[PDB]
Structure formats: C-alpha cells, structure tokens
Amino acid sequence: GPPGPPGPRGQPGVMGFPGPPGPPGPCC
Amino acid sequence: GPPGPPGPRGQPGVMGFPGPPGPPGPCC
Amino acid sequence: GPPGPPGPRGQPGVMGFPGPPGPPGP
Numbered sequence: 001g002p003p004g005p006p007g008p009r010g011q012p013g014v015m016g017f018p019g020p021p022g023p024p025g026p027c028c
Numbered sequence: 029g030p031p032g033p034p035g036p037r038g039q040p041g042v043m044g045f046p047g048p049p050g051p052p053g054p055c056c
Numbered sequence: 057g058p059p060g061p062p063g064p065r066g067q068p069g070v071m072g073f074p075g076p077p078g079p080p081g082p
Contacts, residue, residue: 001029002032003060004031004033004057004060005031005034006035006061006062006064007034007038007061008034008037009063009067011037011066012040012070013067015070016046016069016070016071017047018072019046019047019048019049019074019075021076022049022051022053022076022077024052024079024080025053025056025080026052027056029057032059033059033060034059034060034063035059036063038065039065039066040066042069044069048074050075050076051077051078053077055080
C-alpha cells in the first residue's frame with residue numbers, strides 16, 4: 001500500500017533569552 | 029494493501045527571539 | 057505500506073522576557 005500520512009507536528013521551541021539590561025538610570 | 033503508519037513526530041521548533049532591552053535603571 | 061513522512065517542524069518558541077533594569081543612576 002501507499003505510504004502513511006505525515007507525522008504529528010513537533011513541539012514548540014523553547015522560550016527566548018531575556019533581553020540585555022536597560023540603560024543607566026537618571027540623576028533623580 | 030493499507031497505508032503505512034504515520035511518520036515520526038516533527039522536529040522541535042526554533043528557539044524564540046531574545047526579549048527587548050530592559051528598563052532604565054533606578055535612582056541612586 | 058511504509059511509514060509516513062516526518063511531521064512539520066514545531067512552532068517557534070515565544071519571545072524572551074524584557075531585560076533586567078539598567079545600572080543605577082549617578
């Protein structure tokens with residue numbers, strides 16, 4: 001017989017890294 | 029004969045994008 | 057019959073969190 005249907009979709013990827021730090025604070 | 033079994037599960041997705049830059053730092 | 061083709065790649069992961077606060081001010 002013919003080949004079977006495509007398999008199930010893969011797991012979602014992992015969450016991305018946090019962004020880099022913000023800029024220096026102001027002179028309050 | 030009948031169709032074969034479905035294929036293996038797909039690969040995991042790519043890792044998410046990094047987050048954006050953080051907020052300004054606090055006052056001294 | 058033979059086994060089917062592999063499934064589609066998973067969805068992309070979610071974006072990461074905003075970064076930490078910056079250095080303290082002067």
